[PDB]
């Protein structure tokens, strides 16, 4: 309320000052690490033959900086190592070293509110016809201005979603959704359907009449004081994990379990959650209002708890910009 005004006014203020440095500082529009080299993001180039491109044989993770403060970086670094493990990849540098390069990269950019991406690929030699010991994994890392999956102004009113019906989410026994990946075939078909049906956001089923996740976000339904989020079929979001921390402190029950589609049509409130946007209310579903079409009271306490946590020492730390 006054909390949204404080978050978005501070952002816009910080953005004006970062825009001013675009003249003097060539990393102010983003910075990339490639084969040990720092370059502007618009000029970064990867080998054609990298298997991240050739066969999307990669995982990634995406921490964030708000107001000069890394949010939950170590959760994102732990998830990345665990993602690596499951695809028989290994992070090419020590994690302590990766964390320091990240802090360096944020600081030379001068970006106070940032999207940060780490990519670990199979490398220049592919799986099909190579002995596993000859395989050298490659790292890429980049910082860019914070990205909004829902713009701050649509967050005040709420977006429109559809439950997708031309597409369903890739099932875990084909590709494990707990391994962050860029195989977005289903998600792109869903974004197109959403647009075709006069909406923005797709909600994908598992094909078995339950909900999973959308094109870059988790889903959370609210119903008689209780939050419900799918357990299975979905990426275990660090924004979803924050939702859960905030709820446990406000004494609100969170249920991570199978969530049937039908529950989305008789819930009190709906919101989406991601690092690239935060807490993102849905007020219209399949062309119809969500329980009056207003942004719900619990959605709003979750919203405020989440941004408060960006200033809490347990979840964040201050970067030194020189």
Ligand X SMILES: Cc1ncc(COP(=O)(O)O)c(C=O)c1O
- 58-97 footprint of its own copies as x/- string (CB under 8 A): -----------------------------xx---------
The tally of CA atoms less than 13 A away on the side-chain side of residue 189 is 12
Nearest CA-CA partner of 119 in 91, 82, 149, 85? 91
Rule CB under 8 A: choose which of 74, 100, 183, 209 binds its own copies: 183
Tracing tokens 């909004």 back to the chain, one arrives at 148
- Least distance in Å: CB of 213 to ligand X? 4
Q: Binding to its own copies by residue 142, rule CB under 8 A?
A: yes
Contact 86, 181 (CB under 8 A): no
91 vs 220, beta carbon nearer ligand X: 220
- 89-128 footprint of ligand X as x/- string (CB under 6 A): ----------------------------------------
- Least distance in Å: CB of 207 to its own copies? 7
C-alpha to C-alpha distance for 80 and 85, rounded to whole angstroms: 9
- Least distance in Å: CB of 164 to its own copies? 10
C-alpha to C-alpha distance for 148 and 276, rounded to whole angstroms: 5
Nearest CA-CA partner of 201 in 250, 241, 159? 159
C-alpha to C-alpha distance for 79 and 180, rounded to whole angstroms: 9
112 vs 169, beta carbon nearer ligand X: 169
Rule CB under 8 A: choose which of 15, 192, 236, 294 binds its own copies: 192
55 binds, among its own copies, ligand X, none (CB under 5 to 8 A by kind): its own copies
Nearest CA-CA partner of 107 in 143, 73, 140? 143
How far is C-alpha 191 from the geometric centre of its chain's CA atoms? 16
Tokens of 35: 């084969």
Number of residues that bind its own copies (CB under 8 A): 49
Q: Binding to its own copies by residue 13, rule CB under 8 A?
A: no
Q: Binding to ligand X by residue 239, rule CB under 6 A?
A: yes
Binding site for ligand X (CB under 6 A): 62, 213, 216-218, 235, 237-240, 273-276
């Amino acid at each position: 309320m006054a909390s949204m005004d404080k978050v978005f006014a501070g952002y816009a203020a910080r953005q004006a000052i970062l825009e001013s440095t675009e003249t003097t500082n060539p990393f102010a529009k983003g910075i990339a690490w490639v084969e040990g080299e720092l370059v502007p993001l618009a000029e970064a180039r990867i080998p054609l033959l990298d298997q991240g491109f050739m066969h999307s044989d990669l995982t990634y993770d995406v921490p964030s900086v708000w107001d000069g403060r890394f949010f939950r970086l170590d959760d994102h670094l732990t998830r990345l190592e665990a993602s690596c493990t499951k695809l028989r990849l290994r992070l090419p540098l020590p994690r302590d070293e990766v964390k320091q390069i990240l802090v360096e990269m944020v600081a030379k950019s001068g970006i106070r509110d940032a999207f940060v991406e780490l990519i670990v690929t199979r490398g220049l030699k592919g799986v099909r016809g190579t002995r596993p010991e000859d395989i050298v994994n490659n790292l890429y890392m980049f910082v860019q201005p914070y990205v909004w999956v829902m713009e701050p102004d649509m967050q005040r009113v709420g977006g429109s979603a559809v439950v997708a019906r031309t597409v369903r989410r890739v099932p875990p026994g084909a590709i494990d959704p707990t391994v962050k990946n860029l195989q977005w075939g289903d998600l792109v078909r869903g974004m197109f359907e959403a647009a075709d049906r006069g909406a923005t956001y797709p909600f994908l089923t598992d094909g078995d009449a339950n909900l999973t996740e959308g094109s870059g976000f988790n889903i959370v339904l609210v119903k008689d004081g209780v939050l419900y989020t799918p357990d299975r079929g979905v990426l275990q979001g660090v924004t979803r994990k924050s939702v859960i921390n905030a709820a446990e402190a406000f004494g609100i029950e969170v249920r991570v379990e199978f969530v049937p589609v039908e529950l989305a049509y008789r819930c009190d409130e709906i919101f989406m959650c991601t690092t690239a946007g935060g807490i993102m209310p849905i007020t219209t579903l399949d062309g119809m209002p969500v329980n009056g079409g207003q942004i719900g009271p619990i959605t709003k306490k979750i919203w405020d708890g989440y941004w408060a946590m960006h200033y809490d020492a347990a979840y964040s730390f201050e970067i030194d910009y020189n």
